[PDB]
Amino acid sequence: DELAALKAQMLP
Amino acid sequence: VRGMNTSSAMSAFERMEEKVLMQESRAQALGELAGADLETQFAQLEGGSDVDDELAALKAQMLP
Amino acid sequence: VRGMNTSSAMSAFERMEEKVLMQESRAQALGELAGADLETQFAQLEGGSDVD
Amino acid sequence: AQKRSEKQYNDAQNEINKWQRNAQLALQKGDENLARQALERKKTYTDTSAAL
Amino acid sequence: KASLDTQSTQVETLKRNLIQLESKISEAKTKKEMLKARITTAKAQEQLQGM
Amino acid sequence: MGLFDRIKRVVSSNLNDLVNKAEDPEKMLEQAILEMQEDLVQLRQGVAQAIA
Amino acid sequence: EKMLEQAILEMQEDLVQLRQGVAQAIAAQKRSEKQYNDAQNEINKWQRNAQLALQKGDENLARQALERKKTYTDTSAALKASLDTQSTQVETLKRNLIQLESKISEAKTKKEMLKARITTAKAQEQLQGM
Amino acid sequence: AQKRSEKQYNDAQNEINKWQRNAQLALQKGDENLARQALERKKTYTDTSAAL
């Protein structure tokens, strides 16, 4: 769940 | 980690919870016994009568 | 940093925090109670009325 | 005690928010491992905050 | 080399515990405030209610 | 049994007085956290030797 | 409360002692296994030596190695038998510990129930006083 | 005492709910044994709740 949030956070 | 006889954290938690639970529960329970009185529930109705009759006088007093 | 509980940097923060927290909390509580009383509020209203 | 622990409860969120800087800056280095370790702190502070 | 690998694994096991223990003691710092606040809250009521 | 009966009565008299004397709250918290704050360092002072 | 309180403290210390005993049994199993493993390793080494002896041309040495292997096998067999007997005892101890853990929790629950009935009895006594 | 039992009962129910989520999570994870263990724990919790 940290990866899911992190990948969205790094994406922009 | 396994909780030997006087493991300082575990032993402290036990001793605190003895006080913590007893005191808080006493205060809630004795507070409900002090609040149990029927005349105190009548004091809620009295507060309703008091605020409604004070409003009736007040609305006339502010009206002029 | 981690060797002893008695180090000056570690100890100073603990001692200061207890003293500071108690003083701040006590002063605030006392002030609020005075404000709460009806008589104080009435006087303030009178002063405003007096000023105009 | 409410004012005190409310300040601390606010400060747990202030920490969560500051630890977004940690996770964001780690991502701006490419340090996913470090950003995960920031997200663990924001998680543990969130857990703390509920209890308070 | 056999000993080295075994004790290295054991040293990792100790370090994993230290990381958890650093949490376990943080929790014990934290609760104090709520406990004192509850205690004092109750003690105020304890005096009050008897009267 | 008579020795076990004297154990019941004597150990209960002494332990009831001790648990009533001992168990005031703020004494316990500040000890416990100080003791474990000692212990973490003691553990590291072990584990370093083995790392090395 | 006094009879109940003393018992709870006593059971916990006993459990710790039981755990230590279980650990010793577990340690013993590991030691026997290590000894068994060592015997197997020794047998393997002996087998290589016996083959080497034949290449060397010393007939007596090879024969001696075979005799040693049989002795090692007997020791290994004895160790295996000992391990099996020990294992059953260990399983029983583990089962007892699990049961004990369930039991201590129940005892705590019993104390709460006991406390409530005593309070009720006290109320009845007050009525008699009236 | 009634409140304490209720709290314990509530905690058991909460624990059971958490266990149920974990059991479902275990199936997703692919660890069959863990899910089975959770179910056994739930039964024990239910028994405790029933006793309470």
Numbering used by the authors:
A (entry chain WB): 208 to 219
B (entry chain CC): 156 to 219
C (entry chain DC): 156 to 207
D (entry chain H), H (entry chain G): 53 to 104
E (entry chain B): 105 to 155
F (entry chain B): 1 to 52
G (entry chain A): 26 to 155
Copied sentences from the primary study:
Proteins that perform these functions include Vipp1/IM30 in photosynthetic plastids, PspA in bacteria, and ESCRT-III in eukaryotes. Here, using a combination of evolutionary and structural analyses, we show that these protein families are homologous and share a common ancient evolutionary origin that likely predates the last universal common ancestor. Rings have an inner lumen that is able to bind and deform membranes.
This was sufficient to allow unambiguous assignment of the helical domains within the Vipp1 monomer and asymmetric unit and consequently the entire 2.4 MDa Vipp1C14 ring containing 84 subunits (STAR Methods). To build the Vipp1C14 monomer, a homology model was initially generated from the PspA crystal structure hairpin motif (aa 24–142). The Vipp1 hairpin homology model with its distinct axial twist closely fitted the Vipp1C14 map and acted as an anchor from which to build the remaining main chain. Vipp1C14 rings are assembled from six rungs stacked on top of each other. Each rung differs in conformation so that an asymmetric dome-shaped curvature is achieved when rings are viewed from the side. Rungs are maximally constricted at the top and bottom with internal lumen diameters of 14 nm and 15.7 nm, and widest at the ring equator between rungs 3 and 4 with an internal diameter of 17.5 nm. The basic building block (or asymmetric unit) of Vipp1C14 is a stack of six monomers, each one located in a different rung, which when repeated forms a ring. Intriguingly, the six subunits within each asymmetric unit have distinct conformations, which is made possible by three hinge regions that provide Vipp1 with conformational versatility. As dome-shaped curvature increases toward the top of the ring, helix α5 rotates from being oriented at 40° relative to the horizontal in rung 5 to a maximum of 80° in rung 2.
